[PDB]
Structure formats: C-alpha cells, structure tokens
C-alpha cells in the first residue's frame, strides 16, 4: 500500500530472511509470495508483479552468485535492485538552461494538484538557483488564481494572469513577453483544469503548445488513482515526446506504489513526486530513495540527513562552538531553521526516549505549528550575556525577578520561561555525564 503500508509489508518480508537458519527454495518462494501480495495491495499491475517476481526468483535461485556476500544479503540485493527497476531504473534530471530561456508547460486533470505543484516547481527553481515566473494561462478557474497568487507572495516569484481580459493563448504570449525582458530564465505555464484526459486536456494543450516552443511539458498526475496512472501516461507519451510526469499526493490513498510502477513502465520520464503539502514537499523524483523506503532498508532516516548539503561543510563552524562550550542559545535557531527547511524522518524523536503519546506525529506536528515553538522571543528578550553566563539558569535563581521581566518582555508566562531554563540545564548535565 502507501509509503508506510507497503513499506511495512515489504519490510516485514525482508526481515524474516535476516533471521534465517538456512535459506532454501521454499523459504525463497514464501518470502517472494509475501512481497507478491505486498505490491498487489499497493495496486502495482499484476502483470508487472509477475514479471518482476520471476526476475527476482531467477536471480535468486538459478544464478546464486554471492561473491563475498551472505546468501541473505544477496537475496536482499535482489529484492532491492528489482524494485528500483519496477519504479524506473534511475533518476531523470530536469535540464537547466544556459543563457536565458526555459519554457515549461504544465498539464493536469482537475483533481490532481497541478495548481499546488506549479508553485512547488517554482520553489525548486529558486533552490536550484534560477529565477522563475508564473504564467497563469488557466483562465476560467479563479480559485486557481487565488491560491496560486497567494503561494507566490509567500515566496518571491512574479505571477501574471490578472483579471479576465483576454483568451488563454494571448495571455500566455503576453505573459512570456512581460517576463522575457525580466529574465525569462524559466517560465512555468499551466493549461487549465479540464475534466478528463479524453480530448479535453491534450486537445487543448497543443493549441497552447503551438505558440511557445516547449522545452519540457510536465503532466501533474494524482498518485491516488493508482494504476490508472498508466493509461494516462501512455496517452501523453505518444502525443508529446518531451513529456515528463509528476506524481502527487503520495500520502493518502494506498494506490501510491502502483501509481509509481505504472508511469515508470511507459518510460515517460517521471520528473517529480509530491511527498505532501508544505511548499518544500516536492521531491525531485527521488525514486532511488522512495524505493529504498519501500523494500526497507528503512533507514531513510540517516539517508535524508547525510545526503543533505549543510552536513559535510556546515557541520564544522557550528560544530566547533558546540565542542568548546559556547552554550546552545546560538544553536537553537540554527538547528530549528537549518533543519527548518524540514525533511521528515521517523528518527526525529529517536534521540528522546519516551514511549507515551503520539505515536502519530512521527510525523510533523511540531512543524505544523506556524513557527518552531515559543523559544526565540524569550531568547531575544534575554541580554546577550544573560545567555553567555556559564549557567544562565543560575542567574534566574539568584535574582528571582529576572524570570518575571523576561517572561513579560517576550510575552510568555513564567511557567514556559521556566521550562526553557531547566531544558538548558537538562542538555548540560546530560552531556557532562
């Protein structure tokens, strides 16, 4: 099923093998029957499963070549490497442009999150390091305008569609000119929200295409639909050779895995998936990662961490002031922001041992609160040396009306100010001892 359910079923199937007193055809056939049943609940097309099973079974029986690997590991390696095929061998880069010109055309059935994925592909190209503008060529739908402009004013991206004066083809052409003297480094332009794929999405699309020589045409397709993804992909591949696909809402309904399998079969290059809602939840088809999460591995908690950028270089200059002893008040914010960019992991609450409530925020209910808890503002409302004291808490013992004035100055109560104070000493003693 979804990331978590196929993950567990697949993970469970993988696990039995590790505890193996001897590995035999029988055990093979049952572990392979559990990962057969697992993909089918994720809606991976059953001809697709069949083929992939006898691929693994043959790899795992006839050619039993474990050179310096245990039988188990070389079984795991099989069941791993075949799933990365099942979801498209490798990663399909989006090509950046040199000079000043990349024209990208969004298409999408109403229901998929094309509208949200436009602004999420805007977010990417400011992460990749270019300027991107939004031509909002979908015309009738004025809730589409509403959200998409709101998404654009939160980040920093020019959006052009205005009030309904002109037809689509002409408000594209005038949108491109409006941002071609303003750097046309990438344009992201969406055709409107149509009912079905049957001569509604594409029958329009290539009217819009004919005005602007499209450098990649991306189709935002809803994972929810599962293995109807393929019948979509087929159609778009054929009509448009420069199609890519972006597979959205991986959370939610359990057809995610078979949404992935099905598009990846066509050979229509999957270019993105959506991992959920926030602006940064738009991952660059990390299908190597995703498929690892599926088989498990899992894991995937070191994976996002180590792989990320501020982790080899920028685990140094924070990391010395840590190791000398310059407190943490200057590490709170950094770690709450440098990570604020958020990448969800289970291990987020692995360090703090505490089986009690959720359980379900495994998960980001901390992120969901607009900022990252009320800590910054009592930090600002301390004096710099009130922090830099070798025990700032000692200062709020000795003088008692510091804990009142700093509570009022930040806007907390004294109770929540008292929580931070003892938390600081809690990190301290722990590390000492």
């Amino acid at each position: 099923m979804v990331l978590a359910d196929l993950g567990r079923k697949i993970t469970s199937a993988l696990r039995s093998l590790s505890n193996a007193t001897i590995i035999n055809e029988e055990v093979l056939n049952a572990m392979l029957k559990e990962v057969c049943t697992a993909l089918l609940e994720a809606d991976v097309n059953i001809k697709l499963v069949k083929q992939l099973r006898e691929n693994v079974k043959s790899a795992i029986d006839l050619e039993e070549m474990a050179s310096g690997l245990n039988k188990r590991k070389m079984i795991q390696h099989a069941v791993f490497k075949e799933l990365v095929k099942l979801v498209d061998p490798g990663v399909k880069a989006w090509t950046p442009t040199k000079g000043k010109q990349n024209v990208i055309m969004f298409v999408g059935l109403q229901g998929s999150g094309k509208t949200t994925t436009c602004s999420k592909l805007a977010y990417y190209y400011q992460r990749k390091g270019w300027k991107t503008c939004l031509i909002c060529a979908d015309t009738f739908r004025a809730g589409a305008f509403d959200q998409l402009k709101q998404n654009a004013t939160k980040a920093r991206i020019p959006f052009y569609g205005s009030y309904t004066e002109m037809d689509p083809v002409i408000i594209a052409s005038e949108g491109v000119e409006k941002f071609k003297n303003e750097n046309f480094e990438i344009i992201i332009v969406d055709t409107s929200g149509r009912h079905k794929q049957e001569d509604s999405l594409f029958e329009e699309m290539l009217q819009v295409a004919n005005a602007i020589q499209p450098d990649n045409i991306v189709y935002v397709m809803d994972a929810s639909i599962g293995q109807a993804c393929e019948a979509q992909a087929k159609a778009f591949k054929d009509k448009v050779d420069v199609a890519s696909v972006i597979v959205t809402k991986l959370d939610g309904h359990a057809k995610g895995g078979g949404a992935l399998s099905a598009v990846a079969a066509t050979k229509s290059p999957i270019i993105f998936i959506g991992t959920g809602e926030h602006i940064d939840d738009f991952e660059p088809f990390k299908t190597q990662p995703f498929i690892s999460k599926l088989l498990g591995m899992g894991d995937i908690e070191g994976l996002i961490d180590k792989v990320n950028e501020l982790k080899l270089d920028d685990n140094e200059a924070l990391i010395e002031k840590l190791k000398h002893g310059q407190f943490t008040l200057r590490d709170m914010y950094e770690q709450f922001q440098n990570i604020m960019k958020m990448g969800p992991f289970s291990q987020i609450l692995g360090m703090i041992p505490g089986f009690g409530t959720d359980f379900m925020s495994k998960g980001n209910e901390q992120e969901s609160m607009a900022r990252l808890k009320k800590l910054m503002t009592i930090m600002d409302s301390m004096n710099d040396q009130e922090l830099d004291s070798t025990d700032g808490a000692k200062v709020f013992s000795k003088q008692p009306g510091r804990i009142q004035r700093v509570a009022r100055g930040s806007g907390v109560s004294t109770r929540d100010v008292q929580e931070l104070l003892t938390q600081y000493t809690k990190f301290a003693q722990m590390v000492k001892k």
Binding site: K311, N315, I319, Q335, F427, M430
Partner: peptide, 18 residues
Amino acid sequence: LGFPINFLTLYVTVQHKK
C-alpha cells in the same frame, strides 16, 4: 564529518526533552 555532525545532532535531540 558524518560521525560527529550526525552524532551531535542525535545527542542534542535526545537530551532536550521538548
């Protein structure tokens, strides 16, 4: 690098109860 950076990151989250 991966060791300390990852281990400090780890040791910090556990120690800080909130």
